[PDB]
Paper text:
The baseplate module comprises a heteromeric assembly of the proteins Cis1b/7/8/9/11/12. The symmetry transition from the inner tube (Cis1a, C6) to the VgrG-like spike (Cis8, C3) is adapted by two layers of the tube initiators Cis1b and Cis7. (a–f) Local resolution maps of the CISSc baseplate with C6 symmetry (a), CISSc baseplate with C3 symmetry (c), and the CISSc cap with C6 symmetry (e).
Bacterial contractile injection systems (CIS) are phage tail-like macromolecular complexes that mediate cell-cell interactions by injecting effector proteins into target cells. Using [name] as a model organism, we and others previously demonstrated that [name] CIS (CISSc) mediate a form of regulated cell death, which influences the onset of sporulation and secondary metabolite production in response to exogenous stress and unknown cellular signals. The purified assemblies were subjected to single-particle cryo-electron microscopy (cryoEM) for structure determination, yielding the first high-resolution model of the CISSc in its extended conformation, which also presents the first example of a CIS IId subtype. Our model shows that extended CISSc particles share the conserved eCIS architecture, including the three core modules: cap, sheath tube, and baseplate.
Numbering used by the authors:
A (entry chain s), B (entry chain q), C (entry chain r): 2 to 642
Write the structure that this text describes.
């Protein structure tokens, strides 16, 4: 029937049934099963002479199975198979008891604290991999809605990472009777029999006064809001992505009243989540749905201590009837406490609290939730080593490799801050061995950012002509901007020593240099190589007060057009053995004063032309006047004096 | 008198008096009224057959009024007027009770979670506007001492924001009986009935043994320090602003002993606050006063459970007398618990604990651990969108819009970090639509800081002729510094492909380029336009080994002073068409060897002066010699040979 | 013997024995001693008329000595010399009790909150200085393993800081009976009486059922891992330092089972610490050993309430016998509780729980959280003022003094991040007076990092020419890179106003400037000084369409070799006054057309050589023809016409 006449607990340790000489020694039989934390075994035997543990040879690390038997139900279907973890002995004054404590076959997930990174795997794939890796048989795994680009395990316990993953995906972290892992969606509450049933023809119906020893049901509108929004940033388009989801319905609870009424009956507020990064529409939609489920899970909180039945496993629909106006209907169980003890028969505490750990006190072993000191809430910045540069987008994006976290974690691409903008800007890409400063997006490890490279040992900067600081007043003297080899621009200012001042656009080998030197107001374009100054429509209009073009070997001046030497004063045109002027055309001279044509060797006045010597007077002072042709047209016969 | 004979609870639901058929059912009446958190109603009726909620037609959101009546006091002046929030049913083994839970008319402030920014409004103005937004009638609001400039509400429950503001301003939120907000200063403890009074002529005097059912009074010097300082940074002057305030007095407590004695009797310590940013003297002084009040509020902790009186409202002075040496005097109440229950008449728990909400549990429900991760202490950095760059100071300050927080929050000016210094440095302003990386001052949202622009999709860097990485080892090859436009300063170094090395300066049109090219040692000054090299005291002293000046269509050389062409070897002065040395002054030519003046058309020697040919030999050896004028001074008559 | 016949509590207040008229009034004597928190008295007298405190003249800050006496043990050995801290009264319905709470002398350490930096001192030296400054006598201090460079005190209580040091160094802060501070290693558990000794003879042996009133012994493998590793970064070599330490043994516990048996019987996991920066091998080794000890301290948790004995001081070995298989052996006590009360004799509660504070509830006052709101986890960044720019390595580091933390804290060198790399990069050193934006390593204060200088009031004397923003749409117009004094490179782009575009490499005083101007396709190498353009193997090959070389007061062209003026068109060679060609060598001329040599004054044709005139026609036409020597070789006699 619904209650029980006699109830027994059958416990098997190490695969063998409990010895007949030890079965009467058992007193308490506690089993606390939940969907948020691993279930707990507490088997308390009475050992007045302190000899039990020396006979069972029980050492933690042994398989133990606990089954309840109420009437003829529960002979098959063992309740929970797990592992003995801790031992306790209590001399409380009412009996020197020996307590064996156990955890679920799968508690090892909480035992292991891991760091890792998973690339291009679905959440169900992550669950499958982690579980097997931990030696736990896989039951049924439900594929999740969307894939993840890159997940990082930020130094957390396996159980907690998987638990949050299930929370974000609106799942349940089920661990069934035979120790099989399960990642299953919540069962709909409608499945349970109608409360209008007789209440005695099944074991999933609770009637007020029939088999409800203790009852605590609460329906509240503490933080029920109709709309919940989750927001994120899209970098491939620079878009503010957002998702608004309703919180007016809930699958786990059906009590004739919905949270939509709670939202309507008060002012229409809204809730915002600003604690996790998001990138794609799928992730934002999933987060919005998860937050809506979280908000709607607090609508009803139920806790019934009943005579029980061994079929009250977690995650099953249970109908609550004849309680009142807002408390009828169906619920989905979340935690079940099977209790055997002094003066108490087989007791079952069914607690429906959504995904919260209301059981074992809301605060539980903390402040209502774990706040580890080695969590993912990384404040400020850290240092990292670059491992990859092969960005498929050529935006300077660079992979990282944290050296204080793990030797196999290399993260994903991280955008690096650069002095650019909306319409383009300069880039200073990093090498494959730099040590760069890394910040984080809202503290999350999944989204690192690169600020710039640091300076440490074995990475001293390239040496320069002048030191970093000088002078008694001890101010900055040089402000260097440089590449990784020596192609540099220097902005230096000094009043001591060499008194170097100004700007210096140098080269790697110092062969090429543009010195804007203020110490002597001198522009020095120095080059141990070729020089080339060119224009298109006009050439350098050189000016000043002293010009000089002294180049060895050769000097060629070409015009391809009109050429002019205005001068303005004496033009001393020296030579070194030859002066030549080509027969370009009508060559003409002139002078406002004298005109002299001297030489050292034989002169001549050539030309197949009508030579002439125009003048108001002409006097050949030649020591000898020789003509080898007849002389004509002389006005008078030659006369001396 | 002081104690009472008969005590009643008058509760009105929905504005109508409690029905006569329901009044006997009420058993438990609990009212918990405090000055730190909203008060609570707990009305527990006995409903064995579970039919109450189906007859009263109670839906949360309905108005409820609770009044106590002790003797002939309290018929008027209702105690509290609030709203039903949650429902609870209990089967505890002592009756099937139905519980209605209520909160204050103004609990909605804790219900709403908001993001917003307030500009140039006083704290009292903030409270008034905000409360009027939430549909709560405004009582008396006391004007704030100092005004603010920019307050950000960083995704917080509204009541918590208001409470932090009130704690900053040494204030109190006593919602009145009639549900009216009161932002009021604490009532001074001096204005209280004298302790040496008869103890029976007033309802504000408690005597040990007269009516004090339970007493718990503690006076401690756990963390009493005489002086407390608060410090901040002033940016308009670079000033370390500080305020030291005393903690030797406290308005709320007067127990013949002051915290000054506690501070003096121990070593003279000091306390510092380093958790919030401050900018002005007013804010720092207010923070120092608030911290001093907070420290002095822990001097005395009092908890008296007495027979009570319906006039024991919060925020009223109460005189405690005949208790001992240090426990006499007057206090100001902070929380009051009115209780009706099984085997208990009307009882009043008066608790004085200053700010500390130690009521119910010292840990309350979080062990004094308020870390809701409501994105308040934003860790590390985040991304933001620039909205305003006006800067009334021209220092590059920029208004920041956060895309993951709100669509209407645009913040105040943020001092972007610039790679300069104190006496002047280069400025890189950002456009009106950038995406920048912003840190925060000690995590507070009120003081964002811009680190630099980021790179995302649809904002690619300016295209360049050479790729960002090349080779098999493929180290960094190019280090570009550029404006949003094409003006660039490239520092490039390559070993493969085109083997481009050196420094480049480009104007974006690829016309004006300065190439310090190291692959072939060269300086190239290219420009699709005019060139101009100028000096003041001397001109470019050009040098090298192969000079060339070849500009088409024009070449003008001007001196305005002495001109010299030293040469040193052959000077081939070619020409085409015309070559004329039009010497204004005295011309003169000389030769170390021969001298030749040829022509093709006609050779002419001119000059309006006596021409002269002078040398040992002046032979013609040409052709016919014609003279058209008399020949003179011939020594010998012409003779061949 | 082991139990006691009659037990008394001897208390001395103010150095004088408790008065005879007050000794019967004492009711409750409670002492709580431990190695994690200061010891406490909770003495409780019965004062029905509330007059005790007015006669003893007790004022907190008075010395009090407390001792238990069970049989004839402890008559001259005091248990705890401390100071009265807080007074307390009670009307609990069972008497009007007066309670005097006292704390051990070490409470002063928890009473002071300090900010400071300690320089080149061992941890033992730090403890000695802290204890001496706080007026506490120094007992025995054990020198620690290694020294530290700096240890900042990030606004923390002295006691918490010293406890952190003790936990780091595997040390305990037990305070002895006389009140003398000592900093001691835990006593080994092996140095205890054999578990199988007589039992009654030794006062350090507890037997199940003999004198164990209450017992709670727990042995668990909740988080037992064989190996624990600690990781850190070395900057003098760029190295990943790591230390793996075993957790298979523990000095404090010896119970026939070791944590190695817990680790082996499960999967071989590992644990990592990622919350504390580390620099040297010694520090990493110390951290690994400390974490291993912390993990192994949770193997056994013991709580024994026994018949009491005054020799059960903290930090002494105690042998636990005849309990079972895994619970025999020895323990090192961690906290002791001496209790005298109503209907209760002298009770001693021994608690062995490692370094954890499992003594108070399960979460003390604030378990899990214990995050001082004013803690060391600095989120995001802050502002700081440079105080020293020197560097023993010249890598650009700098010391930073914080203006919101302390006036005497200047920190260590911070590796400022700037655009460098593995093989060298540019550096911008910071001046002494700069204000820089400083991040933090993992939030820890000990490792600040400088990002870059900020801008504030009277901090931007760049004094640039063009404004930082112009226009209606008013995008960024200028991108300045400059030096503290003015030597600058500007990348400016405008469309309105003066319409300036291009690049400008300027100087401090603007005398020297290289303008790449794009509004007018021009290169302006302007300089109020000398100019020098030089080459090595070839000279500037100037080109374009209009050459102009116009320099006043001088113009010198030198070749040192062949010189050529190709020309190609008219060559106008004017002269203000005088012109000349030197007698270099075989000077020659030529003309494709006419040839004219005119002058305004005395002409001549010099040359001490065989002058000649050659042509088919030699028509020398003038106004006369004078020869000063005889004519010869005339072909015919002169003839008119």
């Amino acid at each position: 029937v619904r209650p029980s006449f006699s109830s027994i607990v059958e416990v098997k340790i190490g695969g063998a049934k409990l010895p007949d000489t030890i079965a009467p020694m058992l007193t308490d039989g506690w089993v606390d099963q939940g969907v948020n934390v691993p279930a707990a075994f507490r088997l308390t035997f009475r050992d007045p002479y302190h000899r039990l543990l020396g006979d069972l040879n029980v050492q933690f690390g042994t398989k133990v199975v606990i089954t309840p038997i109420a009437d003829g139900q529960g002979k098959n279907n063992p309740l929970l198979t797990g592992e003995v973890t801790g031992l306790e002995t209590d001399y409380d004054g009412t009996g020197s008891f020996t307590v064996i404590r156990g955890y679920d076959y799968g508690h090892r997930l909480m035992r292991q604290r891991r760091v890792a990174a998973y690339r291009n795997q679905k959440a169900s794939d992550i669950a499958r991999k982690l579980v097997q890796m931990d030696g736990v048989s896989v039951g049924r795994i439900q594929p999740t809605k969307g894939t993840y680009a890159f997940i990082a395990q930020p130094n957390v316990t396996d159980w907690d990472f998987l638990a949050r993953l299930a929370d974000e995906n609106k799942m349940i972290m089920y661990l069934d009777s035979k120790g099989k892992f399960r990642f299953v969606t919540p069962k709909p509450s409608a499945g349970a029999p109608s409360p209008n049933t007789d209440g005695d023809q099944s074991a999933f119906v609770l009637q007020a006064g029939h088999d409800i020893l203790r009852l605590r049901a609460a329906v509240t509108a503490a933080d029920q809001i109709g709309k919940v929004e989750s927001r994120g940033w899209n970098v491939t388009t620079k878009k503010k992505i957002t998702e608004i989801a309703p919180a007016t319905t809930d699958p786990g609870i059906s009590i004739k009243w919905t949270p939509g009424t709670a939202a309507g009956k008060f002012k229409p507020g809204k809730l915002v989540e600003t604690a996790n990064p998001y990138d794609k529409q799928d992730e934002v939609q999933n987060a919005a749905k998860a937050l809506a489920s979280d908000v709607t899970a607090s609508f009803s909180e139920l806790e019934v201590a009943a005579n029980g039945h061994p079929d009250l496993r977690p995650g099953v629909p249970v109908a609550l009837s004849d309680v009142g106006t807002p408390f009828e209907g169906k619920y989905t169980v979340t935690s079940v406490r099977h209790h055997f003890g002094d003066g108490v028969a087989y007791e079952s505490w069914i607690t429906v609290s959504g995904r919260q750990w209301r059981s074992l006190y809301g605060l539980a072993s903390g402040g209502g939730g774990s706040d580890p000191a080695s969590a993912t809430r990384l404040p400020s910045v850290a240092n990292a080593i670059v491992t990859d540069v092969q960005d498929p987008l050529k935006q300077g994006r660079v992979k990282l490799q944290f050296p204080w976290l793990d030797d196999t974690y290399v993260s994903d691409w991280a955008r690096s801050v650069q002095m650019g903008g909306v319409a383009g800007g300069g880039i200073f890409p990093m090498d494959v061995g730099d040590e760069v400063l890394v910040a984080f997006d809202r503290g999350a490890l999944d989204h690192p950012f690169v600020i710039g490279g640091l300076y440490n040992g074995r990475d001293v900067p390239t040496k320069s002509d002048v030191p970093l600081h000088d002078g008694l007043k001890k101010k900055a003297v040089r402000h260097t901007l440089s590449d990784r080899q020596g192609n540099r621009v220097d902005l230096l200012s000094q009043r001591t020593g060499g008194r170097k001042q100004g700007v210096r656009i140098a080269s790697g080998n110092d062969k090429l240099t543009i010195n804007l030197d203020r110490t002597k107001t001198e522009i020095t374009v120095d080059s141990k190589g070729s020089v080339s100054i060119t224009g298109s429509r006009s050439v350098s209009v050189d000016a000043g007060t002293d010009l000089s073009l002294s180049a060895r070997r050769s000097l060629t001046i070409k015009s391809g057009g009109p050429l002019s030497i205005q001068g303005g004063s004496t033009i001393n045109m020296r030579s070194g053995g030859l002066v030549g002027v080509n027969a370009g055309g009508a060559l003409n001279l002139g002078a406002g004063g004298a005109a002299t044509l001297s030489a050292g060797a034989a002169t001549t006045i050539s030309g197949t032309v009508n030579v002439q010597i125009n003048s108001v007077m002409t006097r050949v002072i030649g020591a000898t006047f020789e003509v080898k042709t007849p002389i004509f047209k002389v006005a008078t016969i030659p006369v001396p004096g």
